[PDB]
Amino acid sequence: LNVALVFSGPAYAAEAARLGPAVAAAVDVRPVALVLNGDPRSLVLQLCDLLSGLRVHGVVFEDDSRAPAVAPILDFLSAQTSLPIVAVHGGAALVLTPKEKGSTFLQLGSSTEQQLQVIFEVLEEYDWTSFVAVTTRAPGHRAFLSYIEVLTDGSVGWEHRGALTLGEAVLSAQLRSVSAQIRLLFCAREEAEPVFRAAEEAGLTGSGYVWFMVGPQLPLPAGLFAVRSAGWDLARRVAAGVAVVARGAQALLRDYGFLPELGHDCRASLHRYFNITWDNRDYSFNEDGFLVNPSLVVISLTRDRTWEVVGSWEQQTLRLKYPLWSRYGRTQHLTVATLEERPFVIVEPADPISGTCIRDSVPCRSQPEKRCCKGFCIDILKRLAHTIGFSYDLYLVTNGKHGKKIDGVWNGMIGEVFYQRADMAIGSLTINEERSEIVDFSVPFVETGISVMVARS
């Protein structure tokens, strides 16, 4: 009936338990409890003693320390007793593994599949290519690559995937053997640090590259990106856990009306009762006991070496900050500025079904929203880019049409090019003496001039 609270914290768990009862009451009429000692010997002995002495319905364990160790033995103890354990605030909940027959662990972490789904949702908005996929030969690397191959079909750009055995020089050379601006790495901390040092020695830690670390965790590269659920409060986490436990117990008592425990103190399959809502976040669970449709956040690194929230994913939808982005690429960055001329350059509304530009076209940003530019100049520009190689952005223009010496000052595309705002201009633009002397010109391809159009004849 009651709820047992266990914490492995050596020091903070004391104050947590001191503040416990008020928070537990604040967050069914079932009571609460709190026992903490803070070691498989000690863990097993203390938990068995507590469960023997105290008749409880569900048990919540909260700790954020040495994550990849506690979860298996705790899950085994829960399965042996057949009691609902809930791990919260990282640590045990961070590790996600396939469960057992009678297991009921209710891990509150986030599966790597959800992490990759969120990361790829953030992608296709910043880069179309998941160019570098590097793994450390971790236990989850096989499923990692399988999920990458699953999500890469249909629609993304993609360069290479490799595994690093972690001399640092050999692995650094192997890592640099693949050219890719964006790298996503799957590794643990003890392997994360040497890999970061080797990458720094290999020159890939500059601001040009971005690392999307997705391994289960949490001299340093610039542009680290990761994903987490929430937190960084212990009291709020405890409140959410006890609320979920109480809701599950109330649902169980409504369905059949019997005490939850089944003996299993000295001997001689219920992870299906979770439709849970709390704190404006989804809390339903799957068969394996991991959160379904979670409320996740993506975090990045700042020059102050601190983690700042960048975007939020909820209800299978994303909301980020400063959504506009550009491939800096560092040259190979050319800011193409064009105008609108129906025979040559056609701008059309983006296709809303796919929420993007259709094939045989190029995205174009005005001067926030995106249109699709296509036609003669767009095609010749993309062919030129293919035959040379650079990053081109379709920076359209509004201040003027083609150029005029208004007040001795140029405008239009000529004005944009002259004041270095736009790297180069393509599209409908005729060559004149003043234009040729003010700004250089390439070789003409489509000859034209002054022509007379008359009525029907």
Binding site: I358, R359, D360, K374
Partner: protein
């Protein structure tokens, strides 16, 4: 043709007969479809006309499940009958028999 297809998909019908009837009723401008069926249709309903150079010169086929044991025998029998007069006979009595 990707852009042309994106245009065309806003008027694509669901079957041949309705398309032919609509083309009779001038509810549509131009129809694109297989050569044999349209040749027969023009040979029957002498109101429309067939035109254009053939743009996809791939013949028909009798489809079957992958690696089924019948593929060799079905293909060989079809080829033998086609080589024999059976295919031409079945063709003349069933298609190209009308010229208005």
């Amino acid at each position: 043709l990707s852009t042309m297809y994106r245009h065309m998909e806003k008027h694509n019908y669901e079957s041949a007969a309705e398309a032919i009837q609509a083309v009779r009723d001038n509810k549509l401008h131009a129809f694109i479809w297989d050569s044999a069926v349209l040749e027969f249709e023009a040979s029957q309903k002498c109101d429309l006309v067939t035109t254009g150079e053939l743009f996809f010169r791939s013949g028909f086929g009798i489809g079957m499940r992958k690696d089924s044991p019948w593929k060799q025998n079905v293909s060989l029998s079809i080829l033998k009958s086609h080589e024999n007069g059976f295919m031409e006979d079945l063709d003349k009595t069933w298609v190209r028999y009308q010229e208005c």
